[PDB]
A paper describes a structure:
Here, we define the 53 unique GUSs in the human oral microbiome and examine diverse GUS orthologs from periodontitis-associated pathogens. To examine the structure and function of unique GUS enzymes from the oral microbiome, we recombinantly expressed and purified the following proteins from bacteria strongly associated with periodontitis: L2 and [name] proteins from [name] (TfGUS L2 and TfGUS [name]) and an L1 from Treponema lecithinolyticum (TlGUS L1). Although the core glycoside hydrolase family 2 (GH2) fold is conserved among all GUS enzymes of known structure, two loops positioned adjacent to the active site influence substrate binding and catalytic activity. The presence or absence of these loops and their lengths have led to the classification of microbial GUS enzymes into several categories : loop 1 (L1), mini-L1 ([name]), loop 2 (L2), mini-loop 2 (mL2), and no loop (NL).
Residue numbers in the entry:
A (entry chain A): 26 to 685
B (entry chain C): 26 to 670, 674 to 685
C (entry chain D): 345 to 685
Write the structure that this text describes.
Amino acid sequence: QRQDILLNDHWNFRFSHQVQKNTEVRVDLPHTWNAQDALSGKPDYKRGIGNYEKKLFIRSEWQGKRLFLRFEGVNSVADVFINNLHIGEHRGGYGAFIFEITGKVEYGKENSILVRVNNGEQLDVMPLVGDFNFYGGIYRDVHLLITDEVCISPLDHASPGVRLTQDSVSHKYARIEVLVEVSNGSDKAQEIELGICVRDGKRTVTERNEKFSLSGNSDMQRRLVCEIKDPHLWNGRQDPFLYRAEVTLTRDGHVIDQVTQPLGLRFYRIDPNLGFILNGKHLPLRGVCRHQDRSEIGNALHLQHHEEDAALMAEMGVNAVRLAHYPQATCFYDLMDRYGIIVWTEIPFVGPGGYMDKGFVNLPAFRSNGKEQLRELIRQHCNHPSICVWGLFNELTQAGDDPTEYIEELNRVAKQEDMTRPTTAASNRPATEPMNFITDAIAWNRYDGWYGGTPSDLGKWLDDTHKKYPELRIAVSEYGAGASIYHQQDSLKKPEPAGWWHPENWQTYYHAENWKTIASRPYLWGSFVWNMFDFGAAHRTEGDRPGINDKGLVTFDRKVRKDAFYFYKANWNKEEPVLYLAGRRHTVRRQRMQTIVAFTNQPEAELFVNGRSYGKANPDEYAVLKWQNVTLQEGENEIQVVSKNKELTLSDSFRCRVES
Amino acid sequence: QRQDILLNDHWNFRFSHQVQKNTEVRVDLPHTWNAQDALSGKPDYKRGIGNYEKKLFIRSEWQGKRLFLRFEGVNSVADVFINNLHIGEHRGGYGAFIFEITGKVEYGKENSILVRVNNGEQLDVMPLVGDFNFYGGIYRDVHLLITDEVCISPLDHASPGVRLTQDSVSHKYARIEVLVEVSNGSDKAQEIELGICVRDGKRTVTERNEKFSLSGNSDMQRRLVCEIKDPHLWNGRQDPFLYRAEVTLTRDGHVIDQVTQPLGLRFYRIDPNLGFILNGKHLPLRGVCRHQDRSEIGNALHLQHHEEDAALMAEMGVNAVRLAHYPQATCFYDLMDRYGIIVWTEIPFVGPGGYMDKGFVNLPAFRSNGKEQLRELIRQHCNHPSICVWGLFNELTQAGDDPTEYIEELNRVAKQEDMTRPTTAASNRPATEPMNFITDAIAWNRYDGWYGGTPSDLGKWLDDTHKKYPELRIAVSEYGAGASIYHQQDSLKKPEPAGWWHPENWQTYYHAENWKTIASRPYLWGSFVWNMFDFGAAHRTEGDRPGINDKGLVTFDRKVRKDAFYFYKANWNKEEPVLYLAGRRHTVRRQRMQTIVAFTNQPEAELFVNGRSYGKANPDEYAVLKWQNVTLQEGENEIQVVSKNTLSDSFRCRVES
Amino acid sequence: AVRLAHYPQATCFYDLMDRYGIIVWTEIPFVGPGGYMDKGFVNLPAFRSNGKEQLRELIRQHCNHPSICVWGLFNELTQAGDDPTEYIEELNRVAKQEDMTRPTTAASNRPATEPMNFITDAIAWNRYDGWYGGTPSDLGKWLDDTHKKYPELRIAVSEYGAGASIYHQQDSLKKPEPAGWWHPENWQTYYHAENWKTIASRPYLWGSFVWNMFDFGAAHRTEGDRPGINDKGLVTFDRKVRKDAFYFYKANWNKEEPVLYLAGRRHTVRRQRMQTIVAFTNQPEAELFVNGRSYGKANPDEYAVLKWQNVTLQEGENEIQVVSKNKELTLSDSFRCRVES
Ligand SMILES: [Cl-]
Ligand SMILES: [Cl-]
Ligand SMILES: [Cl-]
């Protein structure tokens, strides 16, 4: 009944700095204008105003309906015009936002949609700093909504208008409360029927409907309640079961409007000594971090790109994700729902880390806008079963303008919006700083063995902190190491992090030792690898090219899994057979005697070097096969590893050459 | 004695796009970071955040005083930090602004000022568009103000704290209402003597004092009424007389704070049919526009630059100047006060003109800020006798977000702030548009004979408008033509304005015809030339080099007066001898036959060509000497002109048929 | 005298030197790296054959100009790497085939021992003692040392100079850092007064050449008051403003146009109350008036320098005027000035 029309095709664009006429060029949404300058490594890429114009014919039959323009993302600040009259402004690059254009168009005519987008710097719109790209543009989809004059309202913070809250969840019973925004845009009072039907496919599981009166040009909220006995729980990747919940408005029979949403029922708690308990059973959060960009296109992502990023994490055995450092797309939360991957999602309250300036500036506009951004985050995505914590900052400092007061304010805003999920944060503060003690959970970013030290520093630090504050729920927000797939060398030696040489073997070593450190500590409720993918950061000058943070387990184009990916796949994915030699891309070696390493989830593998066996071996606790003192021969070599397990015979091999 | 310490020397600077540490460099205020990229013709010059830091030592003997940071101009949005703790933001690149730091520093030790300056694009801080450059930075002076704990307050829209309102002026009597803001920063009540002394050189002209008690931590506004019988009126360039008004705070017989302000007394009115009448006598307003930049340095101007601009204007006989398109430097207002030049100064409410986008966006942060800039402009510069009109917009359009109500709102704000001067605007709308009728006076930007048409079209349009709207007080806000000193040709032909060829002879022809049109029309209360000076406009791609609006009478480096300068000088300056051949820069000619033109304010001159006399000639009504059918030799040629009353002028050129 | 760096210039400018009477050193663009990277000489066949063509072009094109008096062969080459010393000898021989009436010379930055300093008939060195390292007095000792070691060389100073922004001012005379963003004007003034004293006491120098008459373009530079400018001119890059040191030379060198010029007119905000007040004149006397009060008459020293020590300025505004009377001609100069602390 209700209509949702994609508006991405054929816009006109120009930069306000192109001040002459006839300078517009065709673009097609999604779109950023920084996919070339920023990705090329230019730190001063284009940050300012871009102008999108669309011609949209408003049909006559649409008069008497209600028309909305929903934007799923526009970085950073957007001003919307209909036939060149301002209708609204939205400040924030990552929440969806909406405007009703029912009273603003000429029915039966072409009309003009004009979106003036600014991604230039501000001190009053988070994020203010960050180790990533602030791609400017309409980089997510744009939709025309047409509904009945009486509808389930899409206007409240661009939420769906249906909000599904879970309490009393057990293996035996669950209670769901359903908050519905209903809007009467007619001049007449209406007697409507409101109904909720929760379904398993096409089988009704529960159902309640309600008749009530609503005056003209008025909206009110309705909160229905229903129950499910012996509910089918959403249980992570073991069984990511999903009800669909349909809320309908009815009038004289026949549906007049409909909204459907996912319902995944789960209970869980974060235990200071046991970690994360999902539906009564402990669950390691084997996590990675993910940014929303890609090679060549920046953050103008299409559906298939989200799907592919999800598939690669699923393949590696990921069961948790931190979506850094901002609200991300509905269809990615969808995929995490459907795969059973637990989600940490946060507002863009990002501090400087090792860089300059601040993530917090004590401006009324900044503080206020931040609260609206956190309110957008929760109201737009709270229905997703995969979301399990709400994150409030990444790497703020207490020096200069101190955000501790404001963070406490944000924490309270989160609880007003959602009591059912803990808050968390990603800190790089000494443990004594108050801001580590506000959120329900806390976590630190740690690079022991990359930005200085050795991996053993990590377990000591975490052990000490867990001892001094026994009630903290500690996790590793970030840990990782740079790696170019074209940087190879025989020996493990710690590269300079800020230089043009990130040899792949050190990333491998780093994650091996670090996962060992994490896996020995059950008090950590999760760990999150920085990062799943290389991602654009235009100011970086390191690795094999500028403009890239190269700590991904997979390359920026999603083409090449680095060695470390297969290390995590050996450990985390016990379903697909894995047998993978490390260092296949080290193809020109200077030593004759080497240490060979493979990763497997098989019980046993045997190494062969020019057909000459070097023995069977079993992986250690963390899936690592290792043969020291393997003599290669001058010139060409072939290195093959083989494993048999009943009918399952696996093989991996590569070639290489030794010079001197 | 109140202390005023310049803080321009040695600051640390880095762009915020320089994320890495140790990337600061030294700058020395005044400073912009767009003096290289914008003036090189880069359309997307850097519009973003730059961070200035200074270490400043807070002396122990200042504890117990008050301490003010006053910024004369920072484009466009500034946030100021004391020891990295925010103390306020200012939105707007051309008004002065101030923040008190008394309670924000550690006395006796080093402190740090951090000024985070953002010239990035905004849709809520005028100007949004404009044919000029938005040079970012702290491009005007920065002072430390030390005052008594009870002081003449510097905090109200960064005003001087003293307002000199001329409520009645005549050749016999002037009455001046003085408004002084007094601040008590003490925790105890204070009884203080407020005094004002109006001085002529050293002679006290009038004097008024009063005693009151001001309670602790309280601000108050006093209003003393001064009178001057038989006043010495400030009467333009004929006699730019200035009294000095010294307001002082006394306490138990000792002066503790002092503020002096100009007082130039005058009355005037703008007659619909007769033009501008100053102190009872008609003045043609012979005017030019002026921007606050210069080659190589952008808008990071010094005093000598202001002074050289003013002198060049006075040399040409200017007696009115329109300061486009924004509040400019107090120091340049002082100059016009002292020369006697009438000033038109306006808020940066600038529309797109020939270009894209809008001068107005209907959102409340834009409306709010605009009223604040208008209040900033009047409260900060109202004590200059040169400022005679306040302008509200330049080239706004009624399409899209209609700004007409908002301009009515802005008109009422200026009347609230200053009833003694009329409002004006610079329009490019058809006379039908309602926005033309809000301000007391109105004017139009017109380029008949440059952007299409012929100069004769100005008079016809003006005439038609005066007849249709006889109550309008009409002036020409802009008229002008582009020229490069390096584009020369034999004959007069109209260039394509958007092209790379702007021959000088066209600019000279254009101005001589347009002045003729203006000079005939006394109902114009003024005319302003676009522009006195070539200026920066990064998007321009015309003339002899990109990034330059070249409709100036003088070049961007203020080195070379174009031919048109000397036309106006001979018409407007009858005190300095002028005799000047046009076309000396056209040194390679293709025709033997020539029309030789010169400008003069002598009663006659005689032309010589390779020594041969072509005749004594008299100038026309517009100071133009012209000899037709002048016959040049192939090869080298010397053209000379002489007058006696004994002036000479000459240049050499060669002919290649 | 003018040294046209570093390349053949326009005929009309050669003409202008002919007509003023200025002696001209002009040269081929055989320019070395100086303080930068890479080389002026690469031992390619085409490079060498081209260089000869460029020198025959130079001489056959401008030999008629009488102002040209020496022919320059290189600037700041180095012997490290591809040694050009042979190829310098060829060019000098080409010069000799092309023209016998003028000596050849060069502008060196090599230790005096290097052979490439003895090929041409005369030789000069670029010295920056007191700007790039050292004191201005190091220049005298080196020249005399060199003159004593090789009494046959015909030694000139092909380059000496110091950077200055007219917008960099200060109270005291401190050696700035050359590659930094701060070139105060008082230092360039000091540099030239001291270096000219060193030059003018040494008659065995057949000439000296200020680097440079004007600030010139050099995109790579990041010093002084803006990027991309070599700011050692005596006059700005727009030929509009004469820096202090220009007037030190005009007083010294131009004894026909009267000069009376106070130094430091652009330093309009001082921080100290006692000042040394220096002026340059070719008049015989001048009197200094500070806020209308005489600080006495004074005579210029041998190098046209008037100095009044221990000048007391008031806090706030100041007016500094110096005035000369020579029979008919009366000269005055003044500038305003502000003291804060
Ligand atoms: Cl922060
Ligand atoms: Cl507009
Ligand atoms: Cl070399």
